[PDB]
Design an enzyme around this catalytic site. Structure first.
Site, PDB file in Angstrom:
ATOM      1  N   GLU A  11       0.773  -1.243   0.000  1.00 24.72           N
ATOM      2  CA  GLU A  11       0.000   0.000   0.000  1.00 24.72           C
ATOM      3  C   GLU A  11       0.798   1.282   0.000  1.00 24.72           C
ATOM      4  O   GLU A  11       0.266   2.325  -0.360  1.00 24.72           O
ATOM      5  CB  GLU A  11      -0.900   0.026   1.231  1.00 24.72           C
ATOM      6  CG  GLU A  11      -1.862  -1.130   1.229  1.00 24.72           C
ATOM      7  CD  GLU A  11      -3.005  -0.954   0.246  1.00 24.72           C
ATOM      8  OE1 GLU A  11      -3.794  -1.889   0.130  1.00 24.72           O
ATOM      9  OE2 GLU A  11      -3.137   0.105  -0.407  1.00 24.72           O
ATOM     10  N   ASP A  20      -6.504   6.386  -4.972  1.00 19.71           N
ATOM     11  CA  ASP A  20      -5.959   5.035  -5.083  1.00 19.71           C
ATOM     12  C   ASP A  20      -6.021   4.543  -6.531  1.00 19.71           C
ATOM     13  O   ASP A  20      -6.387   5.301  -7.429  1.00 19.71           O
ATOM     14  CB  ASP A  20      -6.649   4.080  -4.114  1.00 19.71           C
ATOM     15  CG  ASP A  20      -8.086   3.748  -4.516  1.00 19.71           C
ATOM     16  OD1 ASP A  20      -8.754   3.019  -3.754  1.00 19.71           O
ATOM     17  OD2 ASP A  20      -8.564   4.193  -5.582  1.00 19.71           O
TER      18      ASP A  20
END
Ligand SMILES: [Cl-]
Ligand SMILES: [Cl-]
Ligand SMILES: [K+]
Length: 164
Positions: A11, A20
């Site tokens: 991440e 994202d």
């Protein structure tokens, strides 16, 4: 290597609101804020999550706090899920990390939908599960991460995260 290090690798860590891979407002270590297109909405969610007026930015300690909460929530979600729990209980510790990774990324609901793969994992048919897992939007959209996770399920080792 443990779940935290694994997810930190997949991440990354950003202290300012960012979008994202799917275009959603996120912060910290993959902490989704909202699916809404409104940056203000995201800023509101942020403040609410942190408990102060952040103006879109947080500290590393704040990021880590969110991360601990998130990991805890994913595990907890797995354990409360009738389709997920049995699999998680049946897997060894390394492979359990791969399952947690998926849930952290796609949610319980998303993962619970990989019925066939789940059944194969339960039966410990590693190569077969790996192939089935790859036949998915998930693999086609985030192939490098998916490969790491799938290799983890296939081998039960951390080889895919070694040298990262
Ligand atoms: Cl496909
Ligand atoms: Cl990727
Ligand atoms: K287990």
């Amino acid at each position: 290597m443990n779940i935290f290090e694994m997810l930190r690798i997949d991440e990354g860590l950003r202290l300012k609101i960012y979008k994202d891979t799917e275009g959603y407002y996120t912060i910290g270590i993959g902490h989704l804020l909202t699916k809404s297109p409104s940056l203000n909405a995201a800023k509101s969610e942020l403040d609410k999550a942190i408990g102060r007026n952040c103006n879109g930015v947080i500290t590393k300690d704040e990021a880590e706090k969110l991360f601990n909460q998130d990991v805890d929530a994913a595990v907890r979600g797995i354990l409360r899920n009738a389709k997920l729990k049995p699999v998680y209980d049946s897997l060894d510790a390394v492979r359990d990390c791969a399952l947690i990774n998926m849930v952290f990324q796609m949610g319980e609901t998303g993962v619970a939908g990989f019925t066939n793969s789940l059944r194969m994992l339960q039966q410990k048919r590693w190569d077969e599960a790996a192939v089935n897992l790859a036949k998915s939007r998930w693999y086609n959209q985030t192939p490098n991460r998916a490969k790491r996770v799938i290799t983890t399920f296939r081998t039960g080792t951390w080889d895919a995260y070694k040298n990262l």
